Assembly symmetry: D2
Homo-oligomer: 318 residues x 4
C-alpha cells in the first residue's frame, strides 16, 4: 500500500547486492538503473526470480533511462568513476576523478529535481562526504531527505573485529566513528560498549589489551584496502549498511545510524557534510545528534572535515 | 537438527505465547506440559495450525506426563502459580507459596536429572532468583546450563520507556538492571546508552531530565503492578524475553543478556543466584561478566542479594 | 505509508495474539480497542515492551474510545458476544448471537463510516459470513475493502493434518475450503495438492487412503469443538490467519487467500457474502476468483450459502 | 547448537550470493573455498561485516585448502571450468568441458570421502545431472545425502512469469519441471496451479491464453541464454534456490523440492540422476516422489534422461 519504489542509480557490485536484499526483505519495487546497456536488465531479470524463493513480491526491472526515477520513494546513488583506455590496468586513482564524479552528481541531481523531488536520497559514490553535498546542491531536496553512507559501514568493521576478540554477538558491540568516511574517519575509543558495558571494563579485565584495540582501530581504517588487495572494492557489507538505512526510512524504525549529513554548526562546522549519529524515520532525518567531544576528539573531527573541504575544492582542478 | 525439542513445563499465559513464538521462528518441536489435564493438548492443537501461516514445521503437542521431558534440548519452567488465593491485586506481592513452589522444583528437578540431564534450563517461576537455585540443586545440571529470567525483561521496560521519550528505536537504547528480579532490582543509571551514546549527553542536551529518568526507573520497577492494576498481567513481554534467551542458545548467537546465574565470588557474593550480564551460546552460559560497580552501586547489589538470601533461607 | 495504523476493535483472546504478531513483524502501530475499561491498556503496555526483543518500533496503545479509528489503515473486528447473557452451556443456540452481534456491528459500522471510510476491514466476529455483510451495510465501505475470516483458518487445519500424514512441510499442502465458515464449509477434495501434485497420486501410492482423507475432513470441520472439549479455544491460528490477510494488504503481496467476500453472481449467488479464493493486494480485494465447480461441488456451496441466508433472514 | 558448518566449494558469482544469504538467515558458519588465491578471503572478510547489519553470528572465512571440508554439515559445489582458448570466435565447444569438470569432481570427491563423509552435498556445476552422479560416485556418500540443483530454479522462472501475467504473488503459483536441468527440461502444463487452482481455470476465464503459456514455457527454457546474452550466467536466483534446499535440510523443514536425485526404477530409469520432486528433511532426502506421468509426459522425461546418459558416456 502502495509498495515503495526504490531506484538504484548505479547497478554495479553494490547495486546487485542491494536489489537482492530488497527482494529478500520484500521492501519495494526495484529499478536497477545504469548507463551500461543490457547489464541492469540482465541482473534485474535474474534477481526477479528470487521473489519465489523469498515469498516476496517486488518487481525488479533494469533501465538505461532517467525517466524511471519518476515516482521514486528512495533513490540510492552508487553511480560514478568509470575508467578509460590508457593507462591501465590499475590507472584510476582518486584526486583526478573529482570533476568526473561532480559532473555525474549534477546530471543525476537535475533529474531528481524534475522527476522525484520528494525522494529520500542515499549517496554512496566516493568520496561520499563530498559527493552527498554535491547531490544535495544540484537536486534541491531538503537537508533532511539526503544522507551519505559511512558510519554504519565503518562501525560494522569495528563492532565486528571487537566481537570476535571478545566472543560475543557482533551487534552487541556498539561504537561510533564520525567526521568522514575514509582515512581520516574518527574512531572514538571512549564510545565503545559491549552489551552496553564500556570497553574499558574488558581492558581492565585483561580480556583485550590496549595494543589489541589499536590493532583493531588500524584494521578498521584500513579494511577497504585489505579487501581491495585480496579482491576488490567491498560491496556485500556496504549494501547491507545502505539497506539498513533505507529500511529505517521505509518502515519508520527511527534507528540511530551514523551517516553523513549537512552540518549547521555542530562540531563548529557549517556549509559541509560529515558523519554524525542521526535518527532515520518515516520523514527522513528526524534528529541530528552532536556528540559531546573533548578537545582532542574535536581536533580529529576538524581534520576529517578539512580533508572533505580539501577534496571539495578539487572539483574544478586541472 | 534433529529438530531441537523444547519442553514448556507450565502451559499457562506465558507458555502459550512462547509456543506461538517458537512456531513463528521455526525454533523446534514444542511440548506443552502442564499439571492441568487436557488444557495443554487443546492449546497445542490450536498452535500447531499456525505452522501453515508461519511456513514453519514445528510439532506442537500437549502433555500431562513428565516422561515427555525425554530428550529435551531446552526446558523452560513457568510452572507455579502467578498470584495468591485470598489475596487481591491492590496488594499484589508474594509470600508463603515458597514451600509449595520449592516442592514443585524438587519434583521437576528429579525428572530433569532422570530424563534430560543435558538440557539447557530457563526458570521463570517466582521468586525467580530463589527458584532457579532450587532447580539447580535438585536437577543436578551443570552451572552453565541453568539460568533465571530477569534482566532481559526488566531492561526491556527501561529501554522501551527511554526510547519513547527520546523518539528512537526501542532496541537502540541499551541498559543494565542487575542483582535480582523484583523490587530490589539494581537500575544502573550510569550504564544507559542511546545509539551507543551515554544517556548523560541527552540529559545535558535537555532532551530528557534527571527527574524524568527517575520517573522511568520507578515505572520499570513497578511495571508488573501497573499492568495488574490495569486488569491484565504481563506475559507477552516475559515470553518474548525468554525466547530471546532460548534462541541465543539454540542458534549459538552469543548475545550478552542479563540473566540470573550462580555467583561464585562476583560482586563479593557466593552460593547465591544473582542477575548479571552473561553470554548465551551453544554450550550454555559461556561467560559471566562482572560489572565494575562503584561502592554506591555495590550497596544496591548487596541489598538485592540480601532479599534473595532472605527468601531461600526460609523454605 | 511509512507507519500503517492498525486498529483491533476487540482486544480479547484473538486481539491479544494479533497485537503480539504485529509487533513481531513490525507491521504497524496498534490500537487495542475494547468496551471493557483498562484491560486493553494493560495488554497494550505488556505487548509494547516486546518491541525490544523483536527489534521493532510499533506503538501499542489500549483504547475505549472509537475516536482512535481516525487514521486507521486496517480495522480488525473481533468485538462481540460468545454466548447470550443469562444462558447455560446446555441451552447454547448459535442463532441466539445473531441479534446481539448485529447490534455491535451497527455501532462499529457508524464509527467506521465517519472516521475511517477508506480503511481495509477484516471481520472475525461470528457468524462471520453474516457479520461481515452486516458491517459492510452499516459501514458503507466499498466491496473491495471488507472481508471475513474463514478459508485461511479452515484450510490451515486441512493442510496441517494432511501434511502430518504425508510427512511434508505444512505449507506445501494446498487446499481450498469455500462457501461459508462453520459446519457447512465446503471441503474441496478435488483441489488438494502436495508440493503442487494432486492428492489423488498419494492415495494411488497408498501414502494415504480415501478413508483417512474423510476422517481428516471430519477433523477439519470439527476442530473448534475438539479444541473447546480440551478446555481451550482456537485463538492462535485464527490470529495468525488474520495477520496473514492484513499483511498481504499492507505489503501489497497479492497472495491468493480464501476469504468471505460479496458475491455478485459468482456460483449463481448474489446479495450475500461467501468464502472464495481472492487476491489481497495494496488496493484491497484485487480479484475474486470463481472456482469452476462441478455439479456436486456447486450444490455443496448452495447449501453453505443457504445457511448464511437463513441466519441473515433472522435479522 | 552447535553452529552448522557450510562449505562453499567454489566462491564465484553464485558462491558470493550464497555466503551473503547464509549470513542474512544466520544459517551457519561459512567457508568460502576456491582454487583462486586470495579472492575467497577478500569476499569472506567483506561478507563477515554484514553480520552486524543482519544481527547474525556466522563466521565467514575464505580458503584455498581442501582441509576446511573437515567437519562440514553441508557442502555446496559450484566449482568448475568454462570459457575457451584459441578458438575463433563463436564456436565454444562444448561438451569439451565435461572431462575438465569431471577431474574437478574427482578431486573434490576424494577430499569429501576422507574429511566429511557424512556431509549433505548439493551439486550445482553443469551439466548438473551428470556432475552430481560423478560426485556421488567419487565421494562414496549415501544416495540420500547428495542432490543436484535444477527444478527449484527452473520452476522459479515458470512460477514467476505466470504470476506476473495473472497478477498474483509469485510463490502462489506452483509448477513441476522435471527430468533434467537444461534445454530438455520437462515442463508439465498439467501440474501448474495458481493459489491451489488448476491453470486451465485461468485459461478458461480468459485471464491467460494457451499461446501465452507456450511463450512463457519457451521463455522459461531460454532464460539462462536470455540473461547470458545480456550479462552472464545467472547467479542470484540460482543461489536463492540452493539456500532454500540447504535450509530445508539444516532446519528439517521437509519441503517438497524438485532436485536431481538417483533414480532406482522411477519413471523406468536406473543408474542415473534425474529431476523429480523430493522431500528434504534433517536426514537428507527423506522421500523421492514419482509423478504419475502420462505417455506423452513419460516420453519427454525419457528424452531428458537420454541426454544425461549421453553426456555421462563421454566420461572415461
Ligand atoms: C561510502 C562508502 O562507504 C563506500 C562507497 N563505495 C563506493 O560506491 C561506488 C560504487 O561501488 P561499486 O563497487 O558498486 O562500483 P561499480 O563500479 O561496480 O558500480 C558503479 C556503477 O555505476 C555506473 N554508472 C556510471 N555513471 C552512471 C550514471 N551517470 N548513472 C547511473 N549509473 C552510472 C557504472 O556503470 C557502474 O555499473 C564507488 O564510487 C565507491 O567508491 C564503496 C564502498 C563503500
Ligand atoms: C521472572 C519474571 O520476570 C517473571 C515471572 N513470572 C512468573 O512465571 C510464572 C507463570 O506466569 P503465567 O502468567 O504463565 O502463569 P499461569 O498461572 O497462567 O501459568 C502457570 C501454569 O503452571 C502450571 N503448573 C502448576 N504446577 C505445575 C507442575 N507441577 N508442572 C507443570 N505445570 C504446573 C499451572 O497449571 C499453570 O497453567 C509465575 O510464577 C510468575 O510469577 C511472570 C512474569 C515475569
Ligand atoms: C471467523 C473465524 O474463523 C473465527 C471467529 N472467532 C470468533 O471471533 C470472536 C472473538 O474471539 P475471541 O476468542 O477473541 O473472543 P473474546 O471474548 O476473548 O474477545 C471478544 C472481545 O470483544 C469485546 N467486545 C464486546 N463488545 C464490544 C464492543 N461493542 N466494542 C468493542 N469490543 C467489544 C469483549 O469485551 C472481548 O474483549 C468471536 O465472535 C468468535 O466466535 C473465533 C475463531 C474463529
Ligand atoms: C544447475 C543449475 O541450475 C545452474 C548451474 N550453474 C552453474 O554453476 C557453476 C558456477 O556458476 P558461477 O556463476 O558461480 O561461476 P563462477 O565462474 O563465478 O564460479 C566458479 C568458481 O569455481 C572455481 N573453481 C574452479 N575449480 C575449482 C576447484 N577445484 N575447487 C574450488 N573452486 C574451483 C573458480 O575459480 C570460480 O571461482 C557453473 O558451472 C554453472 O554452469 C549456474 C546456474 C544454474
Amino acid at each position: 500500500t502502495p509498495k515503495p519504489k526504490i531506484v538504484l542509480v548505479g547497478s554495479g557490485m553494490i547495486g546487485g547486492v542491494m536489489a537482492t536484499l530488497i527482494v529478500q526483505k520484500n521492501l519495494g519495487d526495484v529499478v536497477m538503473f545504469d548507463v551500461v546497456k543490457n547489464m541492469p536488465q540482465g541482473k534485474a531479470l535474474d534477481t526477479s526470480h528470487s521473489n519465489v524463493m523469498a515469498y516476496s513480491n517486488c518487481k525488479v526491472t533494469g533501465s538505461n533511462s532517467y525517466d524511471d526515477l519518476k515516482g521514486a520513494d528512495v533513490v540510492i546513488v552508487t553511480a560514478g568513476f568509470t575508467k578509460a583506455p590508457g593507462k591501465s590496468d590499475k590507472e584510476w586513482n582518486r584526486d583526478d576523478l573529482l570533476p568526473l564524479n561532480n559532473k555525474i552528481m549534477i546530471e543525476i541531481g537535475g533529474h531528481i529535481k524534475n522527476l522525484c523531488p520528494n525522494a529520500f536520497i542515499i549517496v554512496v559514490t566516493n568520496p561520499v562526504d563530498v559527493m552527498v553535498q554535491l547531490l544535495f546542491e544540484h537536486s534541491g531536496v531538503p537537508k533532511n531527505k539526503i544522507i551519505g553512507l559511512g558510519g554504519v559501514l565503518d562501525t560494522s568493521r569495528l563492532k565486528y573485529y571487537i566481537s570476535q576478540k571478545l566472543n560475543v554477538c557482533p551487534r552487541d558491540v556498539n561504537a561510533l566513528i564520525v567526521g568522514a568516511h575514509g582515512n581520516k574517519m574518527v574512531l572514538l575509543k571512549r564510545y565503545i560498549t559491549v552489551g552496553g558495558i564500556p570497553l574499558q571494563e574488558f581492558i581492565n579485565n585483561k580480556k583485550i589489551t590496549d595494543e589489541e584495540v589499536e590493532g583493531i582501530f588500524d584494521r578498521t581504517v584500513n579494511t577497504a584496502l585489505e579487501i581491495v588487495n585480496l579482491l576488490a572494492s567491498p560491496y556485500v557489507a556496504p549494501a547491507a549498511a545502505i539497506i539498513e538505512m533505507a529500511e529505517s526510512y521505509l518502515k519508520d524504525i527511527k534507528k540511530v545510524l551514523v551517516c553523513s549529513t549537512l552540518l549547521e554548526g555542530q562540531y563548529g562546522h557549517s556549509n559541509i557534510f560529515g558523519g554524525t549519529p542521526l535518527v532515520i524515520g518515516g520523514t527522513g532525518v528526524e534528529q541530528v545528534i552532536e556528540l559531546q567531544l573533548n578537545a582532542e576528539e574535536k581536533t580529529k573531527f576538524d581534520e576529517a572535515v578539512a580533508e572533505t573541504k580539501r577534496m571539495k575544492a578539487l572539483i574544478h582542478h586541472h
